[PDB]
Amino acid sequence: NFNGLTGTGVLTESNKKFLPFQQFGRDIADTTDAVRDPQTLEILDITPCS
């Protein structure tokens, strides 16, 4: 539950730049694939559990 955005998945540190005024990331299918940690500002990938 990252600042209200809820979901299930496995986190993973990514190499993406997130335009620091942004918080969430989405793919083509509008699925949340990258969420920023609101406490340490790093970007984490969202992958569905196997």
Binding site: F21, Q22, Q23, F24, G25, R26
Partner: peptide, 26 residues
């Protein structure tokens, strides 16, 4: 206290591709 010391005029022009902003923080 204020006084009317500006009274600026107005005109018209063509606004090209401008005024685009980020709709969300996605």
């Amino acid at each position: 206290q204020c006084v009317n010391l500006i009274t600026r005029t107005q005109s018209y022009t063509n606004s090209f591709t401008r005024g685009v902003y980020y709709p969300d923080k996605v």
